[PDB]
A = this chain, B = another copy of it.
Amino acid sequence: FKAERLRVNLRLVINRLKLLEKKKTELAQKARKEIADYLAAGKDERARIRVEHIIREDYLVEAMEILELYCDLLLARFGLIQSMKELDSGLAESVSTLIWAAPRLQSEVAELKIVADQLCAKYSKEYGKLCRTNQIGTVNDRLMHKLSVEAPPKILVERYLIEIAKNYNVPYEPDSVVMAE
């Protein structure tokens, strides 16, 4: 385990997350316009897939915001990392989430895997790849939900479509079966 390596990788992860959330917000605007165009036509069951894409990306942007927050938290309390040998309570959440989410966002942010390494190679109490996955039952549940790979609720998709239609001056008749239940 190297400390300065972890510091540099944390700063890089922060910068990368900033860039990614910016450009993802922009792409989300453009793809929302695309969904509005799709709704202009009679194609409806396809706009639901497109808006699934959109809300997945939005969950992802929120999760990246949370991860940037946690990385900056670790970077603000780095000396408290170097001094102690076991992490305190103030850093349990950050370390846990940054180790749990690394394989999730490993493709988007590469440096995050190095951060996970330095945070797994520094600890031995329930640590190590195997024990690091075993002791991952203390991560932020909200971030787990944002990065949860699951079909979003249908009613949520209908609400997303209703709002986009209402904004882009396009008519849309929600599926009452899901819109009312």
Contacts and interface: CB of A to CB of B under 8 A. Distances in A.
Interface of A: 121, 124, 128, 130, 166, 169, 171
A121 B130 CA distance: 59
Nearest to A124: B166
A130 B171 contact: yes
Contacts of A171: 128, 130
Identify the 5 closest CB pairs spanning chains A and B, nearest first: A130-B171, A128-B169, A124-B166, A128-B171, A121-B169
A13 B132 CA distance: 51
A128 B171 CA distance: 9
Contacts of A169: 121, 128
A177 to B, nearest CB: 24
Contacts of A124: 166
5 contacts: A121-B169, A124-B166, A128-B169, A128-B171, A130-B171
Contacts of A121: 169
A121 B166 CA distance: 12
A169 B121 CA distance: 8
A36 to B, nearest CB: 14
Contacts of A128: 169, 171
A130 B170 CA distance: 10
A32 B169 CA distance: 48
A128 to B, nearest CB: 6
A130 B171 CA distance: 9
Nearest to A128: B169
